[PDB]
Design a protein around this ligand. Structure first.
Ligand SMILES: O=c1[nH]ccc2ccccc12
Length: 167
């Protein structure tokens, strides 16, 4: 049993809810929240900007030190950093950004990072300002992630479309 509430069950391991990810993390304090990161960990907008704002910029400060030491992530890659006030850990995952011309095949590689964690609160990778089709992102998630993933979808309209169209 876990603390996640109000989710619709899509599969054995994937759950979905219309929820503000900042507000869901604050309520649950999950072991892992996933950030929709870029390779520079520049958390300016979307999931990354909202999560970072909720940490009072402490996520960005920590991220800048990580990049100064390690250099940029790979598209499809990830790193584990603090969850600050939102979670124990934040898994920063880089999905491909279609608005930069990145290979959508890298979306499966991105979701494979989730398999290193037994339970996660996450957004749909490469959705929103990353430009991918969220219906596609949900299909890749279901077909790639084997661990237990609780997906928060910001747009009620999109949430209802993801559920209604789910195979
Ligand atoms: O701006 C946001 N606040 C809280 C959640 C969120 C999720 C996706 C994109 C933007 C936001």
């Amino acid at each position: 049993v876990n603390s996640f509430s109000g989710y619709l069950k899509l599969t054995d391991n994937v759950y979905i809810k219309n929820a503000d990810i900042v507000e869901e993390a604050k309520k649950v304090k999950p072991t892992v929240v996933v950030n929709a990161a870029n390779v520079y960990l520049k958390h300016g907008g979307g999931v990354a900007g909202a999560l970072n704002k909720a940490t009072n910029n402490a996520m960005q400060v920590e991220s800048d030190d990580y990049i100064a030491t390690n250099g940029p992530l790979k598209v499809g890659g990830s790193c584990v950093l603090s969850g600050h006030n939102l979670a124990k850990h934040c898994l920063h995952v880089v999905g491909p950004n279609v608005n930069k011309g990145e290979d959508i095949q890298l979306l499966k590689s991105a979701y494979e990072n989730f398999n290193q964690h037994e339970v996660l609160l996450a957004p749909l990778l490469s959705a929103g300002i990353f430009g991918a089709d969220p219906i596609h992102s949900l299909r890749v998630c279901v077909d790639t992630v084997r661990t237990n993933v609780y997906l928060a979808v910001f747009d009620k309209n999109l949430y209802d479309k993801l559920v209604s169209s789910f195979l």
